[PDB]
Design a protein around this ligand. Sequence first.
Ligand SMILES: Nc1nc2c(ncn2[C@@H]2O[C@H](COP(=O)(O)OP(=O)(O)OP(=O)(O)O)[C@@H](O)[C@H]2O)c(=O)[nH]1
Ligand SMILES: Nc1nc2c(ncn2[C@@H]2O[C@H](COP(=O)(O)OP(=O)(O)OP(=O)(O)O)[C@@H](O)[C@H]2O)c(=O)[nH]1
Ligand SMILES: Nc1nc2c(ncn2[C@@H]2O[C@H](COP(=O)(O)OP(=O)(O)OP(=O)(O)O)[C@@H](O)[C@H]2O)c(=O)[nH]1
Ligand SMILES: Nc1nc2c(ncn2[C@@H]2O[C@H](COP(=O)(O)OP(=O)(O)OP(=O)(O)O)[C@@H](O)[C@H]2O)c(=O)[nH]1
Ligand SMILES: Nc1nc2c(ncn2[C@@H]2O[C@H](COP(=O)(O)OP(=O)(O)OP(=O)(O)O)[C@@H](O)[C@H]2O)c(=O)[nH]1
Lengths: 221, 221, 221, 221, 221
Amino acid sequence: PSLSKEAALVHEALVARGLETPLRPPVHEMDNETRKSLIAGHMTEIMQLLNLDLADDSLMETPHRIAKMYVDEIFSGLDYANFPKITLIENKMKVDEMVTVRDITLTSTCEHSFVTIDGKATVAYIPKDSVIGLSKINRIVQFFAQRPQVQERLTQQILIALQTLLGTNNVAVSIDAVHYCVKARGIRDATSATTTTSLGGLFKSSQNTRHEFLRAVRHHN
Amino acid sequence: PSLSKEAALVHEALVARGLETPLRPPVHEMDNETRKSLIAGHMTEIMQLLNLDLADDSLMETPHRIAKMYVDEIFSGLDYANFPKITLIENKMKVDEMVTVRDITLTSTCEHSFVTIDGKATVAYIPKDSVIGLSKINRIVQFFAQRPQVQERLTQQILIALQTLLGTNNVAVSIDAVHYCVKARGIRDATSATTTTSLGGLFKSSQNTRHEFLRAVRHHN
Amino acid sequence: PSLSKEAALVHEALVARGLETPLRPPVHEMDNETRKSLIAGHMTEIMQLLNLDLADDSLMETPHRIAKMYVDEIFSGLDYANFPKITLIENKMKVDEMVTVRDITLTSTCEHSFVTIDGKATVAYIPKDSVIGLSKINRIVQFFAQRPQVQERLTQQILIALQTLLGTNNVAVSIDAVHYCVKARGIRDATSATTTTSLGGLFKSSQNTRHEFLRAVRHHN
Amino acid sequence: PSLSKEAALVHEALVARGLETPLRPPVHEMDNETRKSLIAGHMTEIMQLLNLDLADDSLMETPHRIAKMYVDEIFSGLDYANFPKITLIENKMKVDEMVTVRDITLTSTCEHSFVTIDGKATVAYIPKDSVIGLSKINRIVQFFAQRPQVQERLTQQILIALQTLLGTNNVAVSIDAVHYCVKARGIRDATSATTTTSLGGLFKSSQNTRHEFLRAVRHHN
Amino acid sequence: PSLSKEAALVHEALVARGLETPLRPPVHEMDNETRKSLIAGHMTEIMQLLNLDLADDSLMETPHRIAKMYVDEIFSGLDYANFPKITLIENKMKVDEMVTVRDITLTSTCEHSFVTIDGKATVAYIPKDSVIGLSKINRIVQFFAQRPQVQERLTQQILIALQTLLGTNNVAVSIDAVHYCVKARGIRDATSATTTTSLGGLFKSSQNTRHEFLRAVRHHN
Ligand SMILES: Nc1nc2c(ncn2[C@@H]2O[C@H](COP(=O)(O)OP(=O)(O)OP(=O)(O)O)[C@@H](O)[C@H]2O)c(=O)[nH]1
Ligand SMILES: Nc1nc2c(ncn2[C@@H]2O[C@H](COP(=O)(O)OP(=O)(O)OP(=O)(O)O)[C@@H](O)[C@H]2O)c(=O)[nH]1
Ligand SMILES: Nc1nc2c(ncn2[C@@H]2O[C@H](COP(=O)(O)OP(=O)(O)OP(=O)(O)O)[C@@H](O)[C@H]2O)c(=O)[nH]1
Ligand SMILES: Nc1nc2c(ncn2[C@@H]2O[C@H](COP(=O)(O)OP(=O)(O)OP(=O)(O)O)[C@@H](O)[C@H]2O)c(=O)[nH]1
Ligand SMILES: Nc1nc2c(ncn2[C@@H]2O[C@H](COP(=O)(O)OP(=O)(O)OP(=O)(O)O)[C@@H](O)[C@H]2O)c(=O)[nH]1
C-alpha cells in the first residue's frame, strides 16, 4: 500500500507550478505516536515558560491535545494518503453547462501565526469530458485547507487541482475568509474579511463567463 | 388506454440525446401491489440485519411505508403515464417578451445514495409560437424530480423537455439544491449548496439574454 | 354621455394588436341590477348542488356577494367607462431621463379558474414629449388587472397602453405574481412566483437601457 | 444686503433651461407676518366650511400653524436667500475619482395636492476642477425639495445646479420617493414608490459610468 | 534611529502628487508632554468661556483627555514613525488573480470641524511581483485615517500608497463613511452616507476589472 493515482496527478501538477506548501524531504518515518509525545513535551515546556500551573487537572491534558491536533487533525492535508477518492462520471450528456458549489465550509490555519482562518469557498466550473462528484469538490477544498496556509496560495492549489482532475481550464475558485490574527489580534479589525479569487479559462479570458461567476459569488444562506 | 402525445415527444427527444434515466427492458408486467410486498419483504430483511425489533408497534409498519414510497410516491416520474397534461396557448399576441417562473419547489432523491435533495428551480423562456400554462412548468420540474436523480442530468432533462414543447431553443433552467448525502453525511457540509444551470438559445449564444437570466437567478421570497 | 378620448385610443391600439381580452359583442343592454340577481340565482343553485345549507344566516348572503363582486368590483376593467382620467403634462423640461414606478399593488383574477392573483408591477419609461401623472400608471395597471386575466397578456396590455398614451416605445413593464391556482391548488407550489416582462424601445433594442430596468426589477420595500 | 453669487449662477442656469421662474423687476409688497395672518384667516374660513369647531383649544391654533408652515417652513426653497452657502475646494488632488452621497433625506410636497412626499436622494459626480463640500449636496437637495414640487423637475433642478456649481456634466441624480397622494388617497397604493433618475456627462453618454451609478442606486442603511 | 524605508517611499510618492505635506519640522524640540499640558491649558480656557464648572470631578480631567487624544491617539497618522512595518511576499505563485479586503474598520476625523467620521474601507488589487500581508492593508487605511482628513484625499492617499508598495497601478480603493459634521449637526442628515472610490490601472482603464470591484463594493456582514 502506497498513495493514489488522482493524488499523484494533482501533486505533480502543483509541484510543476511551485504551489506546494513549504515541506522538506521526509528522510525517515518516525512513529506517529512518538511525534505526538515529543510535541506534547515541547508544549509542556512552553506553558511552564508562561507561568501556567500544569498540576491543574484541565491544563494538564492540554499539551497532549495540541499535539493530537497538529499530527492527526488540523494538518491532515499535508499527507496525500488523506486525499479524497475522486470519482468522475463520463460526460454522456454532453453538458456544455455550468455547476457552482457555493458556501463550502472551509477551516484552515494561517501559516504566519498558527491561528484559525474561518472561511467559505465558492467553486464553479463548466464540464468538458467529465463531471466530478459534488462532495469531492467540498473534500478537495478541505484537504488543502487543513494545512498551514496562505489564502492566495490556497485558492490556486484548489484551482489547479480541479483543473487537472477535470481536464478543463474552465474552473473558478473564490475563498471568502476571516483571519483571526487580523481580527482577534494586532490591528484587531472586527469587521474585515478577505476574498481571494482565482479565475481560469472562460472565467478569465472570455469576458462573458467572467461576470457569470463573480456576480454569483458572495451568498448568505 | 396507453400514454400521451406530449409525453411521447419529450420521451423521444430525451432518448435522442441520451438523457432518459437509466432504465432496462420492462418485458413483463408484475402486479403493483406484489412489487410493494416484495420490496417490503426485502426491507424487513435489511432491518433485521440492523438489529432492529420489528415487534415494536412503529418499526413494524416501516417496510410497507418505504415500499409504498418507492413504488407510488417519490419515483413516480419514472412512469410517463404520470406526465402532466400540457396546455399550450397559441401566441396570437405575438409577444417577444420573457417569462420567468422562479422558486419552484423541487423534491428529488439522489440516485447515488437514495437520500433527499431539497431544491428550488428557476425556469425562464421567450415565447415563440406558443405560451405554456404556468403550472405545467412547476409540474414538468417535479415529474423529472420524482426520480433517482443526478442534478446536472435533471437540469438538462427539464431544458430539452421545455424546448421540445415550446418549439424554441430560448429556454433557461437553473436548479439550486442541497444534497443531504453532502450535508448530513460524509463531508458534512452544513452550509454548501449546488447550482446547476442550463442555458439554451438566446440565453446561451446571444450575449444580452445570457446575463438577463443569470442575474435574476436565486431569489429569496 | 358615452366613453373617453384616452380610453378610445388605448382600446383601438389594443384591438389592432389583438390584445383586448376575448369579448363577444354585447348586442343589447341588460339592466345591471338584473344581472346581479341572475348570477346570484345561479350561484344559489351551485351551492345547493354542493350540499350547502342556505337557511344559515351566513351562507344566505353569499350568492348576493359573489354577484356584487363579479359585476361591480373585480371585473370593472372590462368596462372602459371605468378607465382612469389620464392627465399628461407637456415636456417643457425636455427630460430625456427615466421614471420608474416600482411595487405597484396588482390585484387580478386568473381567467382559467376565477381564482386570485396577487401581484406587484414595475413600470419604467423615458419621457419623450409628455410625462404621465404618477398615480395614472398605478390606475392603468389596476384597470387591466380587474379583469379575468392571463399574466402574459396583462403585461402587454399595460405596455401598449402606456406606449400609446406617452407616444414613445421606450416603456418597460414587469409583473411579479403569485397565482393561487398554482399555490393553493393542484401542484400546490407554496414558494413559486411568476415574473412576466415586456420590454419596448430602448429597453428592448438598445443594449444599455435594457439592463437598466431589468436590474432594478424585483424590490422589497 | 441682497442675494448670493452661488444662488445667482444656479438661478440663471435653471431659468435658461425652463426649470425656474425668470427674475422679474424688484417690486416690494407684504410684510411676512401679514402674509401669515391673511393665510391663517383663509384657513379659518376653509375649516368653517368643513363644520369644524374652532372654539376648541386644539383646532383654534391650526390656521396659524398652517400659515407658519407655508411661509416660513415647507416652502422656504422658493426664496433664494435660503440657498446654502456653497464651499468648493480646489482640485489640486487632480483626482479622476467618483463621489456618491446616498440616502439623502428628501422632504417635499407635491404641487398637485400639497401633500407630503417622503423621499431619499442619491447623488454621484466625478470631480473635474473642484470638489464640493459634502453637506452642501444634502442642502441643495433639501433647498429644491422645500417647494411645491414635481419629482421629475426636482431631479433636473438638482442635476443642473450641481453641474453648474461643479463645472462638469459628470453628475448623476436619483430620487426614490413615496407620494402620499398616491399612497394615502385615490388609488391608495400602499406599496409603490417612484424613482426618477437624471444622468449627465459620462453617466449618460459613456456606457461604463452609466452602470456604475445605476447599480449602486437604492440602498437600505 | 528615526524613520522607515517603506514609509519614506510612500511619503515621497504622496508629496510628488500633492497628497502630503513636505516633511519640514523638527520644530523647536517641544517635549511631547509639554504639548499636552499647553493644549490642556488652551482647552481649560475654552471650557471657561463656555461657562462650565471645572471644579466638578468629571469636567476637571477633560482638558487633559482631549490633549492626550490629539497628541498620542487620533492624529497618530501625522507622524510616519507610526507607519506600519510592511511585509511583501515574493510572487512565487505567479498569481494573476485578485485579492479584496472588504469592511475595513476606518476611524477618522472631519478636518473641517474635528468631528468623528465613521467609515468602512474596501481595498482590492491584482498582485504583480508582490503579495502584501493582509493586516498591512488594514494598518495602512488606519494610518491615513488617524489624522484630520478629507474623504476624497484619504481615498487617494491609500490608493497611491498601495500602488507604490505593490509596484502596480491595479489597485482599487473605496471608502464608505458617515460624517458626524453632516449627521449630528447642520443639515442633520441621519440617513446619508458618502462613498468615495479611487480606481487605478485595470480597475479604471480596462472595462472588465472596473465592474468586478464596483459590484462587490458595499457589503453588510
Ligand atoms: N497575503 C497574505 N498575507 C497573509 C496571510 N496570512 C497572514 N498574512 C500576513 O502576513 C503578515 C505578517 O507580517 P509581520 O510583519 O510578521 O507581522 P505580524 O505580527 O504577523 O502581523 P500584524 O501584527 O497583524 O501586522 C501580516 O500582514 C499578516 O496579516 C495570508 O494568507 N495572505
Ligand atoms: N456531479 C454529481 N455528483 C453527485 C450527484 N449526487 C451525488 N454525487 C456525488 O457522487 C459521489 C459518490 O462518490 P463515492 O466515491 O461513491 O462516495 P460516497 O460515499 O457515495 O460519497 P462521499 O462520501 O460524500 O464522497 C459523491 O462525490 C457525491 O457527492 C449529483 O447529482 N451530481
Ligand atoms: N401562461 C399562463 N398560464 C396560466 C395563467 N393562468 C392559469 N394558467 C395555466 O393554465 C393551465 C390550466 O391547464 P388545465 O389543463 O385546465 O389544468 P388545471 O387543472 O386547470 O390546472 P393545474 O391543476 O394546476 O395543472 C395551467 O397550467 C395554469 O397554471 C396565466 O395567466 N398565464
Ligand atoms: N409625473 C408626476 N406626476 C405627478 C406628480 N405629482 C402628482 N402627480 C400626478 O398628477 C396627477 C393628478 O391628476 P388629476 O387628474 O388631477 O387626479 P387627482 O385626483 O389629483 O389624482 P389621482 O386621484 O390620484 O389620479 C396624478 O396622476 C398624480 O399622481 C409628480 O411629481 N410627477
Ligand atoms: N468634499 C468634502 N467636503 C467635506 C469634507 N468634510 C467636510 N466637508 C464639507 O465642507 C463644508 C464646510 O463648509 P462651511 O461653509 O464651513 O459650513 P459648515 O458649518 O462647516 O458645514 P454645514 O453646516 O454642514 O454646511 C461642508 O459642506 C462639509 O460637509 C470632506 O471630507 N470632503
